[PDB]
């Protein structure tokens, strides 16, 4: 029952049109709570979940400045990778940064992680030990060299078991009412025949939290790893999630197939069938 | 909370 905070950063260029777009979003476990868009009217870091709103103007002042800081070391980097990669200055490009921290059930530091990408390609990532870096090509290999000099490895290690892990706890307490809840998936099955000799069994599940869930279609003990249709768990729009799985079944054998839902908020795996 | 001191470029 561990918890995590993740900060998602994305920078996309627009040659000529104007300064590139910077969308930064933050996620505590699986709930979004802060937001920053270079294009919104505010020009300031914004709240999204209610329990962070209680923090005062000082929190919004620092947080706006430090995220405006990251926006800028990234405009520069958009162009710098334009150079390293020998790419035209007429094309739009995407840098994606992701980093975050893990705390255990009891508040301890577990692990921290940073991963960066260019145009959807793995670029550099922070290693296991938090003391080394890994470059994906010889172009990022030059960045790896520079960070090894100004010691971005150790001063970022300081952050991931310090400033993040504290404020993660504070985030888990200022909203423990709403971040610690475990909502169980409300399960039911539906049936729609496709032809005479054929029919479809689809096992649905709504309103669960967190999104980790497992729907497994088992025919008399057998996994339909080669016969089942599963969709991406999707957000309902309200802080809970939805996911469904379906299997193609011969018309008249809807009892041989069984569905199993295994979730954190479900006491024991439910096995539902026709 | 966001990282406190943004560092070196790439």
């Amino acid at each position: 029952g561990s918890h995590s905070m993740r900060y998602f950063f994305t920078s996309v260029s627009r040659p000529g049109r104007g300064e590139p777009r910077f969308i930064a979003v933050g996620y505590v476990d699986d709930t979004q709570f802060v937001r920053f868009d270079s294009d919104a009217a505010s020009q300031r870091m914004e709240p999204r979940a209610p329990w962070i709103e209680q923090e005062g103007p000082e929190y919004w002042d620092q947080e706006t400045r430090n995220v405006k800081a990251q926006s800028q070391t990234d405009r520069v980097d958009l162009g710098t990778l334009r150079g390293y990669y020998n790419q035209s200055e007429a094309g739009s490009h995407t840098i994606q940064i992701m980093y975050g921290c893990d705390v255990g059930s009891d508040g301890r530091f577990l692990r921290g992680y940073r991963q960066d990408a260019y145009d959807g390609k793995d670029y550099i990532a922070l290693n296991e030990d938090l003391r080394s870096w890994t470059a994906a090509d010889m172009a990022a290999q030059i960045t790896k060299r520079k960070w090894e000099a100004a010691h971005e490895a150790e001063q970022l290690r300081a952050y991931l078991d310090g400033t993040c892990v504290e404020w993660l706890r504070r985030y888990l307490e200022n909203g423990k009412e709403t971040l610690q809840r475990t909502d169980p998936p409300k399960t039911h099955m539906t049936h729609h025949p496709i032809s005479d000799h054929e029919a479809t069994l689809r096992c649905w599940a709504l309103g669960f939290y967190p999104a980790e869930i497992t729907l497994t279609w088992q025919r008399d003990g057998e996994d339909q790893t080669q016969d089942t249709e599963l969709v991406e768990t999707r957000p309902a729009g309200d802080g809970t999630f939805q996911k469904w799985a379906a299997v193609v079944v011969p018309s008249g054998e809807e009892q041989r197939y069984t569905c199993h839902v295994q979730h954190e908020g479900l006491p024991k795996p439910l096995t539902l069938r026709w | 909370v966001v990282v406190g001191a943004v560092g070196v470029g790439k």
């Epitope: 800081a69 800028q72 070391t73 520069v76 | -």
Partner: T-cell receptor, first 112, second 114 residues
């Protein structure tokens, strides 16, 4: 407000211990304080820094210790020498800010 | 021969005139550059911090108008206009945008006279 070095000018004989007063005002946890020294016909350079409560930091015979409790970071030296005569600026980084805030300067004029 | 290189080193300015200063970064891994002013009272004060090429901002203080531009990662420029009080201006860089040691250039002394 913010940083305040109340004593503007300090005059003592060489051999007397030296102390400069520096008080500060932040609303943030991110308290990083600096002493910078600026001689005449030189540039300002760093003398010492810390952000750690009650950690003595020393560098070149000068030392200061941060006391977050009293919003203080006083600069100390055991024995004044003719060579220390300078302008001294104390300055603080409020973490949230991109800028740095300096005091009005304390002139230590050691005489013989 | 140093980490920051600032020009011009000194400039006599008739009142109301302009002077352009520029600073050259000598080590790309301290990219956080800033301009500070020092007034005739010996007080130090921050002016701008700009990271990306293309950044321009203006600011007016007692005695001088400022226009700042980061040309590239290593060339930063500063225009002082409509002066009425002498100054010293310093260029700086540091490894992180705040909470790090701030490193000072040699400085440009400006004097207002006829």
């Amino acid at each position: 407000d913010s940083v305040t070095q109340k004593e503007g000018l300090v005059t003592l004989t060489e051999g007397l211990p030296v102390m400069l007063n520096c008080t500060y005002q932040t609303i943030y946890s991110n308290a990083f304080l600096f002493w910078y020294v600026h001689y005449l016909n030189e540039s300002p350079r760093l003398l010492l820094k810390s952000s750690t409560d009650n950690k003595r930091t020393e560098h070149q015979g000068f030392h200061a210790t941060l006391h977050k409790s009293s919003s203080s970071f006083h600069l100390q030296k055991s024995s004044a020498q003719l060579s220390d005569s300078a302008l001294y600026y104390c300055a603080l980084s409020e973490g949230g800010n991109y800028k740095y805030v300096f005091g009005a300067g304390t002139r230590l004029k050691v005489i013989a | 021969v140093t980490l920051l290189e600032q020009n011009p080193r000194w400039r006599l300015v008739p009142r109301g005139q302009a002077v352009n200063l520029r600073c050259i970064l000598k080590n790309s891994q301290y990219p956080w550059m800033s301009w500070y002013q020092q007034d005739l009272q010996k007080q130090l004060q921050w002016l701008f911090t700009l990271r990306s090429p293309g950044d321009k901002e203006v600011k007016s203080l007692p005695g001088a108008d400022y226009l700042a531009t980061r040309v590239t990662d290593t060339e930063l420029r500063l225009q002082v206009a409509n002066m009425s009080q002498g100054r010293t201006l310093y260029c700086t860089c540091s490894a992180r945008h705040s909470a790090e040691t701030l490193y000072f250039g040699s400085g440009t002394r400006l004097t207002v006279l006829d």
